[PDB]
Amino acid sequence: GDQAARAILIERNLRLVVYIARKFENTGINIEDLISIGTIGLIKAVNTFNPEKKIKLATYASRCIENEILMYLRRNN
Amino acid sequence: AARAILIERNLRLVVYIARKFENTGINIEDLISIGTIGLIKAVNTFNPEKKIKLATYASRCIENEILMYLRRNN
Amino acid sequence: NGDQAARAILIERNLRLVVYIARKFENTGINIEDLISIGTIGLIKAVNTFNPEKKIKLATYASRCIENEILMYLRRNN
Amino acid sequence: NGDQAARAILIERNLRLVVYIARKFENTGINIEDLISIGTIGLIKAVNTFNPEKKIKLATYASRCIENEILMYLRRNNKI
Amino acid sequence: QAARAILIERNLRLVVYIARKFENTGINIEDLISIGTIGLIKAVNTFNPEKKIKLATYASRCIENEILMYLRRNNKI
Amino acid sequence: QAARAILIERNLRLVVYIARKFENTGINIEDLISIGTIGLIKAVNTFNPEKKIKLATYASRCIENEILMYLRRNNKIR
């Protein structure tokens, strides 16, 4: 029910995870870790997104994906 | 924490399972993302008293998530 | 129930959706007749559980439920 | 009641629907007068349960309720 | 009640007998039967299984009243 | 544990067999399969095994009834 609704929104924004993950890729930071971590942020975005406000999902998701990655990068120096 | 330890410690498992689907021609980046969803489902639904190890249960959930995604779109 | 009369209207209005989706799974050598039946079950579940004041259209939600029912049928029989 | 006035407006607005649907079911052994009354009960139920927040016309919804009352009446009286 | 349905269905003829006495207007008998049936439903929903007035007489009044109010609302009787 | 899908899957060809009976009705078979399936769903949800009637017997009655109601409602020859 609610699960299927979130799956639709998650799967439509997967490329957004990759796009942001590639920005943070460089020496020592493996892209495959960043895709996973970023995907976690996308899941958090879809679960907390409020469609009754004027921020589009892709913009709110971008913020959550970045945030998840930055906190991973700070946790692992 | 706790759950976040289990997830971060098994990110490589997603890559290992996703590479099994190389011959589908589907972008490995998308499979990894899809498989990560499977890994997060496995952690959220484990129950350690069922006598099944978390790595094997997660292997199933990761492979299954990818399989459903591939058949849903083929 | 008046709710069931409304659900019946939206199910019958969208039987074509079951066919359009069922026909995509024809390469998985299962009879189209079975796929329509299984897909219809997913349409019934969609209309029964759809939340109209959420932001997902009925056709989008029902396509997901029709797919999910077929995919569960394919995984049970493989 | 204000809500009674609103329901009255909607019932009277769709009485043509009762007659048209009843005429479709008129047959030998089935009195049109009975079908109009039975159909009118279906219309009353439609207006009392209709939800405008959904995406179904009242007329679409009413006609379904009208048909359903007439069908159950014919099944109940063994006129299938 | 489930017994409401029985009371209504076997008083359907009552609606016709009353509605037929108003077909000296310019309103179709079909609409009068529909309106009278509203009067019958109102009577059954507001009937007391007692008192010195019982179903048939109370239903006749409500059926006639609804038809009268429908015709007066459209400026006939 | 609650998987009643064994019952439903076992009666799918019953839907097609009944829907083929209306070959002479000008309704596409795809619609009749869906409508019949609705009938099978109602059968399994209201089947009483304590009564003396087999499920496939009761299921056929609801499958055919669902189709007949759909055809009457749409003014099609039965």
Residue numbers in the entry:
A (entry chain B): -2 to 74
B (entry chain C): 1 to 74
C (entry chain D): -3 to 74
D (entry chain A): -3 to 76
E (entry chain F): 0 to 76
F (entry chain E): 0 to 77
Original authors' sentences:
The vast majority of σ factors are members of the σ70 protein superfamily, which is subdivided into four classes based upon their extent of conservation and the presence/absence of the conserved σ domains (σ1.1, σ2, σ3, and σ4 connected by flexible loop regions) that mediate interactions with RNAP and/or promoter DNA. The sigma factor “puppeteers” involved in this process are SigF in the forespore and SigE in the mother cell at the early phases; then, these are replaced by SigG and SigK, respectively, as sporulation progresses.
Here we present an experimentally solved X-ray crystal structure of SigE residues 17–133 and review all of the available experimentally-solved and AlphaFold-predicted B. subtilis sigma factor structures. Smaller constructs were designed based on predicted domain boundaries, and SigE17–133 was the variant that successfully yielded diffracting crystals. The constructs used in this study lack the first 17 residues as this maintains activity in vivo without requiring processing by SpoIIGA. It is also possible that these residues were too flexible to give rise to discernible electron density. The structure is a classic four helix-turn-helix core found in all sigma factor σ2 domains and covers regions σ2.1 (55–78), σ2.2 (79–97), and σ2.3 (98–117) of SigE, which includes the binding sites for both CsfB and the −10 promoter DNA sequence for transcriptional activation.
